[PDB]
Amino acid sequence: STIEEQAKTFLDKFNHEAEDLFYQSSLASWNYNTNITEENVQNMNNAGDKWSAFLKEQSTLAQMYPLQEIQNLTVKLQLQALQQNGSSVLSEDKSKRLNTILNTMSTIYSTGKVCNPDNPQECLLLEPGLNEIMANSLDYNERLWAWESWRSEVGKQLRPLYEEYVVLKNEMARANHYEDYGDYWRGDYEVNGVDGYDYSRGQLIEDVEHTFEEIKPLYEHLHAYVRAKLMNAYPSYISPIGCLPAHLLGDMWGRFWTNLYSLTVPFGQKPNIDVTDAMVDQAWDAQRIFKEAEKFFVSVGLPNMTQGFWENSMLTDPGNVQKAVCHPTAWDLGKGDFRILMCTKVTMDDFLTAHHEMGHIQYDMAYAAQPFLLRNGANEGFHEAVGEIMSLSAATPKHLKSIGLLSPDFQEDNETEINFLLKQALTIVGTLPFTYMLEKWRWMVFKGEIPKDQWMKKWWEMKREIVGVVEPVPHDETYCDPASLFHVSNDYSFIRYYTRTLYQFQFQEALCQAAKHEGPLHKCDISNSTEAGQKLFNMLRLGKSEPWTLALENVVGAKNMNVRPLLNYFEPLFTWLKDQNKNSFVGWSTDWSPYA
Amino acid sequence: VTNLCPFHEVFNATRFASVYAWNRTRISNCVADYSVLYNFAPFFAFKCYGVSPTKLNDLCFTNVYADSFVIKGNEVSQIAPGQTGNIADYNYKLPDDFTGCVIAWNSNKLDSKHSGNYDYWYRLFRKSKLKPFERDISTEIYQAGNKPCKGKGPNCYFPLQSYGFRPTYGVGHQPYRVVVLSFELLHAPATVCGP
Ligand SMILES: *[C@@H]1O[C@H](CO)[C@@H](O)[C@H](O)[C@H]1NC(C)=O
Ligand SMILES: *[C@@H]1O[C@H](CO)[C@@H](O)[C@H](O)[C@H]1NC(C)=O
Ligand SMILES: *[C@@H]1O[C@H](CO)[C@@H](O)[C@H](O)[C@H]1NC(C)=O
Ligand SMILES: *[C@@H]1O[C@H](CO)[C@@H](O)[C@H](O)[C@H]1NC(C)=O
Ligand SMILES: *[C@@H]1O[C@H](CO)[C@@H](O)[C@H](O)[C@H]1NC(C)=O
Ligand SMILES: *[C@@H]1O[C@H](CO)[C@@H](O)[C@H](O)[C@H]1NC(C)=O
């Protein structure tokens, strides 16, 4: 028997044992998030430890088959994913140090509290205390206090931990034959051995920067318009040519400009489409929402939800004694078990979230036939992009009127279209420079291009230049403002939100063309279009079995990420923004600061 | 009609044998009344090969062989002549000229104990493909490499794996009970007929 034949038998034994152990861990994790008890914490840890130990043993056994002697690429993909060392390539001492740094930074972030001055007892956590301030408060000093105190009392604790975190992560990545930890993260988009579909890790940097150059004109006019509206609200705080103060952006970091909508709404006398009152007028419950979502996917040729879905999912808050983690999630426990955990309320937001989460379920049911190690999105941005395009069609007035939630007499004029597109750009467009600049800073830190004594200096030079955002308080090298975000202090790659954003509009533009949609792209509804559903399913069933460049080609016809569909979506707003900024300064000066 | 064929035991047994060691029962010297079969259970995958089911009462055979076992929902389709997979290749294989019927029905209530009904095993590895109508109850350690095994090892595997039946699974993974009726007439006068 050849090495490739022994690996096929090894992967055959692995698939059957992994599906059982993964189901035990997923079921124990479900029983805790739906019934938060102390007994369920231990059963979740016991089942999770047995699953983690099984993978560590199989990873060592998988590393006994040399990949060079395997020619079947589907077998090589499963062996390569299982042979991934990760932290197991470091010494036992350094891996124990690394896991301690990771737990401490996660503990500092989740438990870090800030106490108001003159009351050492009135303290606020990030969630919900400081987040409520950064999302609703209009007081300059109150927002400045929450922004600065979170970074000077919690971020400074993370600064020494993050320095040793970079050293050990670089030693881990370089022992796995990567350039640095940033190059390690970029391996999620790597493709080798497929002629015409290969993709290098360094190519992601060039593609992200190239597509970002085309986003600059739209973002600069969005930035200029937001600055003008905010300058009328804070005339003594904002320069007409300077960057935007970092604490006046809608959240703790300015990751999304969504909350700036009340002050930057173009036509503040035309109300939003809120079918929440209509859902209560028609006695809608949580089952009706998910039933309507089920009808949506069925209308495009996708299968209905399994019987076990309606029986095992938790589509409502358990209430009273039984507590649960109300964050909406989609569960793929395996072996035909698909569930959705959600404390659904009769609102329009939960209506759109149900379509977003059931889109993850359709993705899971599609590639369930794949081997165990190939049951995932094409890359890190695929799964979340599939869920986003579902809420895009479900929120259009064309769809809301076809289901009886929006009145037929309700007419849509170009003033409500601009209000909708502006609200969308504050979240979608407003996060792209934030995401790219943050991830580029970490790429350069891991690559060694930013010295330790210039971490915070380079961080805010890039905020001013790339994001057009200035810090309200000068920060020396005792701070660690990037670590004040969850993903940085909890060791999660961030570029997935940039690629996913460009993916979802590539998906939507392609599916809407298959649905024969006429008019602006943002008004599209792919409902009742089996042709669009067939084109999407041709990628969902692939899972990780094929390169992401090929999976993307099955939907959009192109092999690479493209920013043109994103610009096609926001073109009605981009032309309106340019007309609004005809007597305003577009761009920003990086030398101005609110503390100058 | 005084000697009805004992179909009350095949389709209503307390528990069925594993697929790798499927149970075989011989039915002969009796009057066969298939009309009561639908009363036994809500049949899901009734399928006859080489004989029209509606005429089952109008035919005679020398002997009948009922092969009973339990498989998963996905593996039900593997019980068919000319089929390949795991059950059809290493556990239970039908002849290419198979004549008879196959009756498969869901048993989620009786074969799911909420903690894993690991009493039902299936053969995962074998040296060669199973001959038609053969039982391989051998439990020798399977060798995948070239080194001697004489027991379990890195490339020495147990040929049998236990099903993890639970009631929480979907219809595709919930246990299905299968009874394959094979009709045979070699030389002897048919002692099995209809009413
Ligand atoms: C949740 O846990 C409590 C604590 O034992 C138990 O009484 C209750 O039955 C559990 N509920 C469910 C749905 O498992
Ligand atoms: C690769 O192996 C799988 C089984 O693991 C098989 O189904 C597939 O046909 C093989 N592909 C090639 C190109 O040999
Ligand atoms: C895993 O780590 C070992 C050393 O600990 C190394 O020799 C091997 O090449 C690594 N393999 C992979 C796939 O990372
Ligand atoms: C899905 O719909 C079909 C009819 O098109 C129905 O036969 C089937 O039972 C449904 N599935 C579930 C799980 O209800
Ligand atoms: C889709 O078809 C249904 C009937 O099958 C109809 O009630 C609904 O209005 C249609 N919606 C769209 C957007 O065409
Ligand atoms: C909307 O269209 C009307 C003409 O139909 C035009 O006069 C008006 O300027 C437009 N407004 C915007 C914001 O596009």
Numbering used by the authors:
A (entry chain B): 19 to 614
B (entry chain A): 329 to 523
Show me the paper's own sentences about this structure:
We measured the affinity of BA.2.86 RBD for ACE2 using surface plasmon resonance (SPR). KD for ACE2/BA.2.86 RBD was 8.3 nM, 2.2- and 1.7-fold higher than XBB.1.5 and Beta RBDs, respectively (the off-rate is notably slower for BA.2.86). The cryo-EM structure of the complex was determined at a nominal resolution of 3.7 Å resolution. Comparing with the complex structure for the BA.2.75 (as a representative of earlier variants), we observe a small tilt of the ACE2. The effect is to move the C-terminal end of the first helix of ACE2, responsible for major interactions with the right shoulder of the RBD, slightly away from the RBD.
BA.2.86, a recently described sublineage of SARS-CoV-2 Omicron, contains many mutations in the spike gene. The characteristic spikes on the surface of coronaviruses are formed by trimers of S, linked to the virion through transmembrane helices at the C terminus. S is made up of an N-terminal S1 domain, responsible for attachment to the host receptor angiotensin converting enzyme 2 (ACE2),2 and a C-terminal S2 domain, which through conformational rearrangement executes fusion of host and viral membranes, allowing entry of viral RNA into the host cell cytoplasm, initiating the infectious cycle. The RBD is positioned at the top of S and can adopt a range of conformational states, from a fully exposed “up” conformation, able to interact with ACE2, to a more hidden “down” conformation.
